[PDB]
Amino acid sequence: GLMQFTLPVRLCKEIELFHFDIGPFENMWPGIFVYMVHRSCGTSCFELEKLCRFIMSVKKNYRRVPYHNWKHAVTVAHCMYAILQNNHTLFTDLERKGLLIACLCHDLDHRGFSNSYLQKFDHPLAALYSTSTMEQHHFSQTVSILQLEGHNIFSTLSSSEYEQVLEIIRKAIIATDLALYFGNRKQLEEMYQTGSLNLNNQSHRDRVIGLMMTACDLCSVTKLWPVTKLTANDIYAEFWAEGDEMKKLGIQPIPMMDRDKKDEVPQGQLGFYNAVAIPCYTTLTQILPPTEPLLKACRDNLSQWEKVIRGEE
Ligand SMILES: Cn1ncc(C(=O)N2CCC2)c1C(=O)Nc1ccn(CC(F)F)n1
Ligand SMILES: [Mg+2]
Numbered sequence: 001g002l003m004q005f006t007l008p009v010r011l012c013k014e015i016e017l018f019h020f021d022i023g024p025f026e027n028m029w030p031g032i033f034v035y036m037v038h039r040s041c042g043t044s045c046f047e048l049e050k051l052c053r054f055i056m057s058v059k060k061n062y063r064r065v066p067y068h069n070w071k072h073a074v075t076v077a078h079c080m081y082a083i084l085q086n087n088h089t090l091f092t093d094l095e096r097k098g099l100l101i102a103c104l105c106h107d108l109d110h111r112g113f114s115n116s117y118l119q120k121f122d123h124p125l126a127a128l129y130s131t132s133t134m135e136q137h138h139f140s141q142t143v144s145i146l147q148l149e150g151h152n153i154f155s156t157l158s159s160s161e162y163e164q165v166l167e168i169i170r171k172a173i174i175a176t177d178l179a180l181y182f183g184n185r186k187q188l189e190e191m192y193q194t195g196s197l198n199l200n201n202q203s204h205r206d207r208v209i210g211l212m213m214t215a216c217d218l219c220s221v222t223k224l225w226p227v228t229k230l231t232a233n234d235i236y237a238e239f240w241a242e243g244d245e246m247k248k249l250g251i252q253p254i255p256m257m258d259r260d261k262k263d264e265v266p267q268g269q270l271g272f273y274n275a276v277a278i279p280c281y282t283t284l285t286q287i288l289p290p291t292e293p294l295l296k297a298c299r300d301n302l303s304q305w306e307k308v309i310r311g312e313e
């Protein structure tokens, strides 16, 4: 009951900021996550014995891939923690509980390859789940880990509170499929502009939670420039591995994924900030004004990529 996680002073302060990097010490990430749960949710949300066992099984079920790894899980949960803390009163207790767990589990058992690569490979997961393939797999893995003896962190919820939280997690994890992001954001854009947006409308909330998940998933573009730039190498290491595997199936990959076209990366970032990241944080800032620092950081990094192209680094 009376056992707080505490962090050293620098982490204790910086963790509250959107741009916090969780650092290179793996062994501190579980504690960082427990800390965020205790402050976002309370010291009672979860049995510490069970939360700890759940965290360590989730960690075990992330693989040693360059980008889609346990550090990404904890990073994406931290961005959600900063959103929730800067919008205290807008979110239910169930939503605070469910959304940090959703972020921690959102990429469970990722191999580092896109839904498209699975489909071209004819991976069994592509037959089991025709759309949002890896994302249906991540939610599946989440439910399995929740079902291990000792791992059900939700078991103190009422039956219907339980059904609601699993349904928050499922929708949240599916929304990390970027193929669905474009439509979701357009629809949120129209609702915000015509003024029909209503957060007491579950389907409207669902959409806003989906945009939050896209925002947290892409949060590498909202870091200090050196974090952003070094993460992009991890991101590209997976993309180029996928390009290699495409070439193996006898398919020329799109240039983003072709390691023979490293030159073209700074420009491919511009497309990505302009087509994806800036629109996502713009709509997010319109709907939840206190998330503006993510838009400001994203804009700073677009400008740093413009500088790379202009030879100036
Ligand atoms: C930086 N960042 N963060 C996350 C992702 C991403 O797409 N993921 C993570 C898994 C799929 C990227 C990224 O660089 N994406 C890019 C780069 C060029 N393009 C094509 C079009 F958008 F320009 N997309
Ligand atoms: Mg994913």
Ligand SMILES: [Zn+2]
Binding pocket: 072, 076, 106, 107, 176, 217
């Ligand atoms: Zn992710």
